[PDB]
Design a protein around this ligand. Structure first.
Ligand SMILES: [Ca+2]
Length: 231
């Protein structure tokens, strides 16, 4: 109805996503005490390069992982805008990047405590793909729900407020959410804090703990996003 945030990703093929709306990561996060695939020489990089994040000219954002030399590159977009409790947030996404080493995600983040991982897929061959509600930044308090991810188009929707968070895949009117978490489930539930707001993140990383080894994978690896809408 009345959207408080939206991008329909319109624009010519090969053009940049809207840089006034999205912060495109210029480097992968530096990691204290890295695991094997988080080491600086093995982890996937992020950059603001049209080879890794571009509009397709048909109304989709493409976030793309590529290999150049011995280095893999992906991309991460984070909204400048932030929204608080009581909204519904949805993206329509097609994951064509479900390959060894890849680690796509659609999530709501904060620099403070808490995170809503709406859909995450792990190319490490070890971890189930999942939707996760995190109460703490240390990753020490959460509720998670395993989901299965195919390569078809889906909508991924969350609604969250002070009292809980709910998730739907391919929402239709009256559908029961596939996963719901109430405030009572997490002692350190942060989402009821006054003024608490979250930004939208869409990203495709390579390697790190979630992706691990990209050898033998299919690159370029593509994550397509038709829109993000919040109301
Ligand atoms: Ca679109």
């Amino acid at each position: 109805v009345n959207y408080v945030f939206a991008d329909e990703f319109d624009g010519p093929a090969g053009s940049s996503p809207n840089t006034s709306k999205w912060t495109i990561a210029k480097a992968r996060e530096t990691i204290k005490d890295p695991t094997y695939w988080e080491q600086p020489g093995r982890i996937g990089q992020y950059r603001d390069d049209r080879k890794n994040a571009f509009l397709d000219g048909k109304g989709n954002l493409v976030i793309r992982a590529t290999k150049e030399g011995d280095t893999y590159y992906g991309a991460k977009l984070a909204s400048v805008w932030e929204g608080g409790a009581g909204h519904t947030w949805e993206a329509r996404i097609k994951f064509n990047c479900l390959t060894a080493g890849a680690w796509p995600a659609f999530w709501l983040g904060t620099l403070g405590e808490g995170e809503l991982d709406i859909v995450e897929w792990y190319g490490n061959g070890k971890w189930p793909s999942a939707t996760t509600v995190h109460a703490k930044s240390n990753g020490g308090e959460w509720e998670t729900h395993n989901i299965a991810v195919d390569t078809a188009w889906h909508t991924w929707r969350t609604q969250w407020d002070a009292n809980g968070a709910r998730f739907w895949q391919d929402y239709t009117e009256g559908a029961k959410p596939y996963f719901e978490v109430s405030a009572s489930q997490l002692p350190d539930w942060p989402f009821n804090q006054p003024g608490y707001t979250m930004f939208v993140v869409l990203n495709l990383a390579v390697a790190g703990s979630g992706g691990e080894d990209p050898s033998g994978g299919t690159y370029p690896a593509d994550m397509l996003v038709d829109y993000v809408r919040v109301w």
